[PDB]
RNA sequence: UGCGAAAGCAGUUGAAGACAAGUGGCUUGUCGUUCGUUAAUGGCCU
């Protein structure tokens, strides 16, 4: 004896709860807690706003800045946070406590555009304003940086480090010309420069060996151990505004990097197989500052999009008595420290449905009825019509019916003749029922209204099929 | 539908038959109880027999025959026996 | 170095006697119910029921001792009819079995360890051309014998009597009658019941044999009620029966599906009614309270009598033919499945199952081959209709005369079965009707049975009008010959009286298995390649040249060819290159060939051998035109183009043979073929007839059919082996029985298959204390 | 603790006779060493087996019970043949025989002579100056029926004719539990409780060596020429000394150690080994009462040595009828598609125009039937 | 010695039995691990310990056939709708009885069953019977070897318990009776070697809800016989 | 039923014996008959 037989992009589109919070101005860029990004900060104008992974609104914020602020950046330990403004007095202060300010030290009088900590050191902080020089301040003695990292032609604008290689700082100016200084050097020359063409929008280092820079309507990669480019991509309407990278998360892609390009859609490439998008999802206009959370968000994982208008789109994935209990205590032992173990279980299968058990018990009439209801699925109806035609006799399935039962069959063949895979089979269905039931329509003259309606729409559809066949005949002639 | 045969003394069940698939409404027999014929709203009249020596020693009834010759229901049966008719 | 050696097992060989049975099963147990003595046509199998293996076979060719009873040429109807447990001669004294075949040949076979080479080939006097049965109890054994009318045998009850004349068993001649249409024996053998047909009407008797106790007869016109006095013969006709061991209850299973129960003294009538088709299998329990019933529905249905209700067993994947309980306390149901999805052969299936949870123990198969027609006395079981699976009641003499005189006056007798051999484990696949049978012939059994269509094979027993809903028959499946893929192609039919019922439509798919499992998972399906309504009859797989056997080129009877190679960037099967020459003619006599290094593609169309190249899918027209002949033309309608290696070649047509050299682009040799075959084949069948070696050529098989003194029922295998491109007739192996195919197993050997389905091959003081304590162990 | 009450090997080490208790009644089982089920039961709880010894030669055990009977019990005929009574209803403590003549020792300190060929009591004597006595051994010198060696708590030596103590030995602080002669001049003594066997000369009485185990001794076997002594410790290990009488000059330590641990991290305690020349048979209760054996070849195993044994610990009970997912493997497996990628044999407008002859046929027959 | 002390248990001990001749105890509880001990007065150990998942067993017992005494089938059952039989052979082969032939609508559970011999009384096929409880008044007698529904018996009022009393008839013949109670406490006493029909019925002097009936003195479930004449 | 192809091409479509029924006899229909031609409310569990 036996039983009875039964008859990637999905991951990034099971991202939902995409809510909107409009700011009062644009969103410069954002930040993430490096040890655990269960909170994150956006750089609103004259305030920095910090949100959790649960309530999805501001859990803390600071708004006693006096000018528009530019850069928000956590330290790698994730306890305090830096913020650079348009005044050029860059302020570092402790996170998870907004109302205290640790130290606000002036940079050059130009607006401090970017400011980020060292990626592994906990006491040295890189700042860059429009003084054509960037600075490695030390927060222990924040009275002068250790390095006046000079050697720019114009407008040092985006900083980064190399992660595993400490002494290499990759700065980028509005000259192409991505510099990478050694911190033990004189601070005036890089060992080499990377030749971007446009002014770089920002640069990150996705490996200890490979960085990606973006500026202008295409982004570039750069090898650092040999001064080499292996890749560009430029399928964007405007310049790729911001970049982001993530390693070792839960997907059919091991590690991702996204580029956001002021044109609604944000693109999700991968260094697994050289930078192809799975699918990019649009937004409500000019997308300026967009990134997903890093690796250790632990399930609940948020992508945020602060547009150049200023609206933040947040789209998140999210995966009797004691005596009676002592009466039924032994319920979880499951055979650990004793000799043999039986297992003879029958499995509670998938939910068998009423039409399915109608086929199982030869209940063909109510199987037809359960097929032709709007509550059931259309493709389920197509498959059960195909399967019961292949299984049983349509004559003995229709051996006693009348037109009041026949009418949803015709009412659904009305829309199912236009199908590609079930057209001729539902034509065979109506062929059998009119093959053996002419006496019913000549007794009751009702359903010939649907017969003539069917006739004119099937003349339309046979004209459509004829013209499609002759258009592929045009392809055959112009082969 | 559960045609149940109870014993008179000791007030106990003797047999059961859930062969009827609806509400039984009527049933009769003959003189020395060789048969019992039942019917109800399954429009089926069916038989139980106690004729043979094994059935009359063990006092046992078998679901011998079954017969549908009706349109909607049964609400009454009765039976008669004679030496001129049965 | 080559020789005939027939090796592997065959059919279970039951009582294949139409109505000359009541039991048709003698696959017995020992009195210690742990090992199963089942006869075959090719072996005796002793099975350990606690492990479902064979602890000992008694093969039907290993001893001339036994096989002098059955090794002859045309009288190979020596089928095996009764097994008893002990030595019959000595009174009950230790445990070695006794065996009777159809001629009354008493055999005393050994049962434990290794046999003693003196089997007591005893024989009683009268048993010349008969044995219905003997019936057993203590001491007295009573033989049912048959002599010779209206096609009715005569049954006589004699007694084996043997007291002191130690070299002769003598019969004692109790009972006589001369009319039998149906008979049956009890489950304990102590009672039997037959019919007599003796007009004022037909009649039925129930008789004893071990005493004078109960011997009676009565017409069954009283049992036939007025409804079956009135209506048709499928309601008047007894299909099966059963009696009780007590002698007070007779079941008659009528051909409509009703199961009458009648008594003995008062002769009452009692009706059991669930079966919709006919009923073939009726048996009582030892206590006589449950009636086991098996009909053409796929259910095992057992009735409790004193509720007149039933316990089911839904999907036995076949057709139940005979069933009873045979445990002494009644714990084991022995039965026979048949599974008539191929109408060619009566390929049964012996199995028993426990009474505990109705789990089946030791499904005993034979090899189930897939022929093209009926073989040799292949009758059909009695149903109510003359359906596509069997004939009806009224066509008994009609269909037996039709089949007998069809084999007499016919000339078309090929029935060449297609098989395959797995290069992972060297078991052979019998690709069944919409299914497979993976037979491991090394221990002559099966391993699993996979369904190969999404049809109505499983989930519904086929009933009177659904019998003409035949299942989608597969033609063949191709192994990727690293042993990785079943690329199967199957044809499918609709039910008739339908406008879409015209065409027989086509579907292929692809199956992957690991070496762990025995089933295969479905990778992908392709519904009608080469467009719609085109046969895909010849598809060729590739050697390890391209991507370790990923090439499979599909072809047509029209002549179109596509290339199909697996890949992994698309984790799926797909095609490579396209060609469809749409001839407005068609011809299903097409062969193909392919070079083992991957260079030449050979389309053997209807007498034209067109040549394509491998690299660019086209006719090789080079830049020289100096004997770059890429189009041959042969003598007549060919059926095989076969490449043994890259130099020389064999093409086979209807009338002759030809050999081809292609490096030296000429023809070589020729043999005659129409002096062997007359009209036996259908077209395309020589391809599945002969199959090449890797080195040593092929074995062209002589198809013969031995004349009467029209063909008689003597047959042939006088196969002559060839070596290295039509050079040597180095062996003419003679054999007295037919053949269907010859394949190459990879030890340079050639396994052939018989119709009487035997697979074979042409190939290359303390010691006394310890012993007495071993005796005191049990 | 061991559910075997006691056990003893046959000479030449092929059979084990062991007394166990089973629902407050002792039963005796015999077992060979490469199933036997002739359990001689006892009658009642007040009758338990104190001591036992094989004989060698119709094969038989003799069993000294705790009332004053010696049940000479054949192993083939599964019953006691002869019942050697004594005069007292006192529980005996040891038996030992040589040829025909057999000695028994009482709780009332008497010495009893028996003969298993003639079934009499020959002589009957208690002696002075030895009171707690629990085991003896006849000293063999060919036909030395005289000079048997009696031992509890201070080992004595007895001529059977002058019938006095001829030589006393330093015993132990406990009663003696093993007393085995090993040569014509040396004998092993070992008390209960103590780790310390000691070989005594039978002429000079000086201790030659003290064998130090690592746990309490339970039993011991020795080779025929005393070149190898295997003891079984109380905690179920085994200690085999090689060449104990050759000189660690006074107290010989354990030479090789064998335990039998399972592969489940479970040690099973072995007991009652037997050594002949270069073969060692160990015994251990596999289930709760059935004794299994093992024939370790002895000289080439390492010094410490564990013996793995197959043991059901968490084994999945697998039927002879079901697969992994529990389907009857006497029937056919079912068709399925799973998640196969469905595509026809083409690669869309020709997928459409394939059924276009069928579609025009269906629609013109539809027009046919609607005008019919 | 505490008989659980060698290998302990965790849940309650809902069933406890002895082998009829061999020195074996069986323990069975809600932690679905039926253990078997070899028991003796000094130190008693675990012979085997079958565990079976998803079936917290309620009652379980030994059984031997009267005829050839070499069967040794455990029967076990819990709150579920299946019970298990076991031929013990010192890796186990156990069968799962679940085939209810006649009545399928009266068992919400199998948690109360007994096992009992009977004779055939026209032949002498002495064999087993499982006696399961039902829900209304139903107690069903099956087969022990096969699993066939032999028959059933319904009493009027809710079954609380039941027991089995054999009685000899001749030297080699005997007859089995089933005794069943209500909560009300009027008992039915009916033989079941012929068909199950009431041959005596009476009433206990008292009780509002009676809970447990047990017969004894001669032989019974707990003290079974070995030869048929020993009953 | 034969060939062949997913196709058309050619034929059986008989006789005897026995029985049943309607009217010794006749008349209508069959055959678990020799021979010839290739021709029954009864539906799938835990």
UniProtKB/Swiss-Prot annotation, chain A:
Its main location: nucleus. The keyword GTP-binding does not apply. Keywords: Nucleus, Repeat, Ribonucleoprotein, Ribosome biogenesis, rRNA processing, Transcription, WD repeat. It is found in: Nucleus, Nucleolus. SUPFAM superfamilies: WD40 repeat-like (SSF50978). InterPro entries: U3_snoRNA-assocProt_15_C (IPR018983), WD40/YVTN_repeat-like_dom_sf (IPR015943), WD40_repeat_CS (IPR019775), WD40_repeat_dom_sf (IPR036322), WD40_rpt (IPR001680). GO terms for molecular function: U3 snoRNA binding. GO terms for biological process: maturation of SSU-rRNA; maturation of SSU-rRNA from tricistronic rRNA transcript (SSU-rRNA, 5.8S rRNA, LSU-rRNA); positive regulation of transcription by RNA polymerase I; rRNA processing. Pfam families: UTP15_C, WD40. It comes from the Eukaryota. Coiled coil: none annotated. GO terms for cellular component: 90S preribosome; nucleolus; nucleoplasm; rDNA heterochromatin; small-subunit processome; t-UTP complex. WD repeats lie at residues 22-63, 64-103, 109-147, 151-191, 195-232, 235-279. Involved in nucleolar processing of pre-18S ribosomal RNA. Required for optimal pre-ribosomal RNA transcription by RNA polymerase I together with a subset of U3 proteins required for transcription (t-UTPs). Interacts with snoRNA U3. Interacts with MPP10. Component of the ribosomal small subunit (SSU) processome composed of at least 40 protein subunits and snoRNA U3. In the absence of snoRNA3, forms a complex with other t-UTPs. This complex can associate with pre-18S ribosomal RNAs. Present with 358 molecules/cell in log phase SD medium. The gene is UTP15.
UniProtKB/Swiss-Prot annotation, chain C:
GO terms for biological process: maturation of SSU-rRNA; maturation of SSU-rRNA from tricistronic rRNA transcript (SSU-rRNA, 5.8S rRNA, LSU-rRNA); positive regulation of rRNA processing; positive regulation of transcription by RNA polymerase I. It comes from the Eukaryota. WD repeats lie at residues 274-313, 469-521, 531-574, 584-624. One of its GO terms (molecular function) is mRNA binding. GO terms for cellular component: 90S preribosome; nucleolus; nucleoplasm; peroxisome; rDNA heterochromatin; small-subunit processome; t-UTP complex. This is NET1-associated nuclear protein 1. Present with 6560 molecules/cell in log phase SD medium. Its main location: nucleus. InterPro entries: WD40/YVTN_repeat-like_dom_sf, WD40_repeat_dom_sf, WD40_rpt, WDR75. Keywords: Nucleus, Repeat, Ribonucleoprotein, Ribosome biogenesis, rRNA processing, Transcription, WD repeat. SMART domains: WD40. Involved in nucleolar processing of pre-18S ribosomal RNA. Required for optimal pre-ribosomal RNA transcription by RNA polymerase I together with a subset of U3 proteins required for transcription (t-UTPs). It is found in: Nucleus, Nucleolus. It holds the Pfam family WD40. Interacts with snoRNA U3. Interacts with MPP10. Component of the ribosomal small subunit (SSU) processome composed of at least 40 protein subunits and snoRNA U3. In the absence of snoRNA3, forms a complex with other t-UTPs. This complex can associate with pre-18S ribosomal RNAs.
From Swiss-Prot, chain D:
It is found in: Nucleus, Nucleolus. It comes from the Eukaryota. Keywords: Nucleus, Repeat, Ribonucleoprotein, Ribosome biogenesis, rRNA processing, Transcription, WD repeat. Its main location: nucleus. One of its GO terms (biological process) is positive regulation of transcription by RNA polymerase I. One of its GO terms (cellular component) is t-UTP complex. WD repeats lie at residues 13-43, 44-83, 171-210, 212-247. Present with 33100 molecules/cell in log phase SD medium. Interacts with snoRNA U3. Interacts with MPP10. Component of the ribosomal small subunit (SSU) processome composed of at least 40 protein subunits and snoRNA U3. In the absence of snoRNA3, forms a complex with other t-UTPs. This complex can associate with pre-18S ribosomal RNAs. Belongs to the UTP5 family. Involved in nucleolar processing of pre-18S ribosomal RNA. Required for optimal pre-ribosomal RNA transcription by RNA polymerase I together with a subset of U3 proteins required for transcription (t-UTPs). PANTHER family: WD REPEAT-CONTAINING PROTEIN 43. This is U3 small nucleolar RNA-associated protein 5. It comes from Saccharomyces cerevisiae (strain ATCC 204508 / S288c). The lineage of its organism: Eukaryota, Fungi, Dikarya, Ascomycota, Saccharomycotina.
From Swiss-Prot, chain E:
It is found in: Nucleus, Nucleolus. WD repeats lie at residues 8-47, 52-90. Transmembrane segments: none annotated. Belongs to the WD repeat UTP18 family. Involved in nucleolar processing of pre-18S ribosomal RNA and ribosome assembly. Present with 9570 molecules/cell in log phase SD medium. Interacts with snoRNA U3. Interacts with MPP10, UTP21 and UTP25. Component of the ribosomal small subunit (SSU) processome composed of at least 40 protein subunits and snoRNA U3. This is U3 small nucleolar RNA-associated protein 18. It comes from Saccharomyces cerevisiae (strain ATCC 204508 / S288c). The lineage of its organism: Eukaryota, Fungi, Dikarya, Ascomycota, Saccharomycotina. The chain holds residues 239 to 476 of 594 of the full protein.
